[PDB]
Amino acid sequence: AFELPSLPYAIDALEPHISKETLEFHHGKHHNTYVVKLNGLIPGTKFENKSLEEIVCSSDGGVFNNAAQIWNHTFYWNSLSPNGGGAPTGAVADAINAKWGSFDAFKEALNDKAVNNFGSSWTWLVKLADGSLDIVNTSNAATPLTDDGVTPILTVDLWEHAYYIDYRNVRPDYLKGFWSLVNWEFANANFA
Amino acid sequence: AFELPSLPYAIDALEPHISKETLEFHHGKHHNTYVVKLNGLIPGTKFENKSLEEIVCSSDGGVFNNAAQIWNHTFYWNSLSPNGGGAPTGAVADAINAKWGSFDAFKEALNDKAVNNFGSSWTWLVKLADGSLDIVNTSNAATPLTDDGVTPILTVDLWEHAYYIDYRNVRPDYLKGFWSLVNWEFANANFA
Ligand SMILES: OC[C@H]1O[C@H](O[C@H]2O[C@H](CO)[C@@H](O)[C@H](O)[C@H]2O)[C@H](O)[C@@H](O)[C@@H]1O
Ligand SMILES: OC[C@H]1O[C@H](O[C@H]2O[C@H](CO)[C@@H](O)[C@H](O)[C@H]2O)[C@H](O)[C@@H](O)[C@@H]1O
Ligand SMILES: [Fe+3]
Ligand SMILES: [Fe+3]
DSSP, X not given: OOOOOOOSSOTTTTTTTSOHHHHHHIIIIIIHHHHHHHHHHOTTSTTTTSOHHHHHTTOOXXXXXXXXXXXXXXXXXXXXXXXXXXXXXXXHHHHHHHHHSSHHHHHHHHHHHHHTOOSSEEEEEEEOTTSOEEEEEEEXXXXXXXXXXXXXXXXXXXXXXXXXXXXXXXXXXXXXXHHHHBOHHHHHHHHO | OOOOOOOSSOTTTTTTTSOHHHHHHIIIIIIHHHHHHXXXXXXXXXXXXXXXXXXXXXXXXXXXXXXXXHHHHHHHXXXXXXXXXXXXXXXXXXXXHHHHSXXXXXXXXXXXXXXXXXXXXXXXXXXXXXXXXXXXXXXXXXXXXXXXXOEEEEEEEOSGGGTHHHHTTOHHHHHHHHHHHBOHHHHHHHHO
16 A cells, blocks of 8 residues: 655765765665555454555554654655754744744754653744744653644654664753754745 | 662573573663663752652653663563563462463463564563453553552563564564563462
8 A cells, every 4th residue: 555755865975964864764764664564454444445644644543653653754754854054944934933932042942842752752943823932741652743833854763763763861962963954945845 | 869779690691582682781771771861850859868669650741662671671570580481370370370270371372462562562461459350551661550449469561672673573482582581470479
């Protein structure tokens, strides 16, 4: 049914911020496993012919954990880039300034939400229904995609498999890696 | 203030099932961090004079997450032993045979609960109010210590940091490691 998407860049393209070995396990094993599991759960069910987002927004239990993780990881890979990092640009830079006053205050606010997102989790930059940006944390497979009117803009995976190989227990060091890779083109594409 | 308990065995005593590197990060860094963080949170609350278990059973939020994780890890180190593994003995073996019919059926049941305990979690062997054994899963820092009438007997930490260095994504391989280390003396002590 579903297929694991290709990575949007070569396996060593995020070096030295996220390693090749991390992409091999994170994309090639964890993301793949969610796709295999969902496909095993859907045959001959009321989800067998629905799109992935349709499944994510209409399931619970194991179907939801697997489908939402497939979606969350594809969004995460797009949130990184070997040509990303550095200062934000375009409409998202201005929207960040409108909410937090400055990019540095936004980065401090997102780092604080990410470091403190307890357990397996995701930290998201979203555009609320009212048009403003905000930072929100979700646990396990939960995702702002299920929230009517909220538009996911970027995400950082904080499950330990996302960073343990490269950074062990030090999330702030992984977050420095993330800021060096953040894909402002994808953020702007989602914001607009 | 609280202190990080010593490990009950040498750093390489669980080799080759859990590595020295895993114990250095897992005990020396993760377990330690929960101790430091709790020792920041307590003062100025109705907690600074309470024992660890008293805090675990009457707190929520960050105090609970750090205090429950300190308790859960100390319980987890005691659940392993370089002289453990193999068939269960004593009262716990008999109780296992009473609930599941055989040790092999128990192991299959616990393995299924642990492999499928989604996200950061713990799988516990507990003794119920009625005297029977059961397997229960908790998420993040939740623990049966807070359930009236339930007595924790053994635990397996399923947060990814407990096994990623040694086994990466393969929980079943980590669980084989756990069966080779399970401390039946601690289980029997807790059961009696
Ligand atoms: O996909 C199997 C089940 O996964 C979840 O439940 C598992 O993980 C929980 C922690 O996130 C545990 O509490 C639970 O015991 C496990 O079975 C999901 O919640 C279930 O609905 C799925 O069927
Ligand atoms: O210890 C600080 C807070 O930790 C928890 O909240 C963090 O982790 C949650 C995921 O488990 C996130 O949803 C949340 O946004 C983070 O702040 C705890 O639940 C809070 O009560 C603590 O203050
Ligand atoms: Fe992930
Ligand atoms: Fe742990």
